[PDB]
Design a binder for this molecule. Structure first.
Ligand SMILES: [Ca+2]
Length: 119
């Protein structure tokens, strides 16, 4: 669920307030369209697409599904007790959190005008 994803980000990118990733570029947060503005945005684009795929699973709601995971000693793990939905969503989140940690953060891309720039 979003709460867990937030924690994944706090654990892979402790150096940033998690909210820095909640409204960035065309895909990080609300946004879900247009040309990804940079690498970080590209991280979010695959994350968004990943969620759209997971939603194909019956009763699978990525923002809400509580999965089983651990963040310990610099490592994020999706646990084996996860059902298909939980496993899928957890993986989307895990991969995005890791992707975020390796992407440059450009303040200029925070809170951009979606209507104008993400067509
Ligand atoms: Ca999004």
């Amino acid at each position: 669920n979003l709460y867990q994803f937030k924690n994944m980000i706090q654990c892979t990118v402790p150096s940033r307030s998690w909210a820095d990733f909640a409204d960035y570029g065309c895909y990080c947060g609300k946004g879900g369209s247009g040309t990804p503005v940079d690498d970080l945005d590209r991280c979010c684009q695959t994350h968004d697409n990943c969620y759209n795929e997971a939603e194909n699973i019956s009763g699978c709601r990525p923002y809400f599904k509580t999965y089983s995971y651990e963040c310990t000693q610099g490592t994020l793990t999706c646990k084996g007790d996860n059902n298909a939905c939980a496993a899928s969503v957890c993986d989307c989140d895990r991969l995005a959190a890791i992707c975020f940690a390796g992407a440059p953060y450009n303040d200029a891309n925070y809170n951009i005008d979606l209507k104008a720039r993400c067509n």
